[PDB]
Structure formats: C-alpha cells, structure tokens
Amino acid sequence: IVNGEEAVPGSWPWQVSLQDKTGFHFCGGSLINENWVVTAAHCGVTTSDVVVAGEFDQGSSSEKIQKLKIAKVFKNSKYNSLTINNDITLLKLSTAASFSQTVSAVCLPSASDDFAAGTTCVTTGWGLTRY
Amino acid sequence: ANTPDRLQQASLPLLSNTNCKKYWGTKIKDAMICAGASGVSSCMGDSGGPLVCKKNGAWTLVGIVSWGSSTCSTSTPGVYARVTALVNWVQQTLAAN
C-alpha cells in the first residue's frame, strides 16, 4: 500500500498472508470463516502454498500466528486471464483456524447490497509501500 | 521498492463504474469495483487482500485487491474484484465443498 499507514496490531483479524514453500508472501487473503479464505484468482495459489493468520510483523518471531495448510483451491471458473474479470479464488484449509481476538472473519455482503460511490472504505496488506 | 514488515492500511473512496471507466474504459467489467485514485494505492503484494466497508457497523468484504496502475499511481483508480457480483459463487462453493 502506497501512502497508507501502519495498522494497529491485530485490528484486521481476517487479513491473512499467503506464502509459498519458502515462506515468501506473494499475496494476501481474507478469512470468511474458520476454514475458508477468499483471495484473488490471479495469485495462483496451490496446495503447496500456506495461509498465515494472526499476523502483523513479518520480520517478527514472537507473534502467535497460525500457519495453516491449504487442502483445496477453487478459482472462479469464469476467471478471465486477459480481462481479469471474476478474479476470485476460494481456499479451504486442511486444518481449520482457531479464532481469537487477532484471528476472525470478515462479513460477506449480499449480492443485492449497494455500497455507493463516494463511500470511504479500507484496504489492508503487506504490499509495496513505494513502487 | 519498499516492502513492509508490518501490516499497512489505507482509507480510500469507492468510485462509480462510469467515473472509473473515464480512465480505464472498457477494461472495467461487471465483476469489478473501483476505489482509490485518491492519494493511496494498493500495490504488488496486496493482491487477494481485502477492501472492506462497514455495513451496519460491521466490516463487509466489498472488494478483493486485483489490478490497477502498473506503477501503483495513487491518482489512478484501483480495480478490485466486486464481491457482491461474486458472493453467490462463494456461497455455492461453500455449500458444495
């Protein structure tokens, strides 16, 4: 996030870090319940990748985080690699997450909800803070 | 060039499809929602992450970090996957797996 600020530790409990074999963060995701994470289809997540929950600092060693393995990956069949439309993939964890104060779920809207233009929302992540 | 160790957050406004198309044109498809273009920008490593808006006092996943300015311009619209357009697919997947 370019021009964002540091979040309060544990304040966005659904935010997860998607890492690969080497533990390299390549994408983020959101917990919608204890066993499902919604991410982007272009991230190219596999069963070999690991979902990390309850995290804030990645250079840390003390945080009680949960490194949950992925058992199933479900990329939206309608995902278009050229238009990038339907850019959503669902992850089912092999081992379910243990909810706490720093690990919980985000609400999902109804297909009929209208979040009008102008609405200030929030985006979170460990992405580049400067291109 | 700077990747953070600590989680970052950023407030950003939702944009109309029309307003967004004024820049991205026909690239903006039905399952996409634009936000940003206001001084902040999601960037490499943010993909898959959440774009939340608090519906009824609770943070609701309205968007998923997808694509945008290749240089992460804080002045161009950021494109996120529209969850309202994908929510039923989500539900249907949970209900069958």
């Binding site: 600020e5 979040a7 309060v8 530790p9 544990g10 304040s11 966005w12 409990p13 919608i32 706490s100 104060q101 720093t102 919980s104 779920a105 985000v106 609400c107 999902l108 929030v122 | 957050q9 407030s11 939340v52 608090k54 519906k55 006092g57 609770a58 943070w59 609701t60």
Partner: peptide, 11 residues
Amino acid sequence: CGVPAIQPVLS
C-alpha cells in the same frame, strides 16, 4: 464477523 476485537484506528 466484521467486528474486530482489537478495534482498528484510521489516522
């Protein structure tokens, strides 16, 4: 869902 135990503070 959507109500963090640890409240997020924007700005």
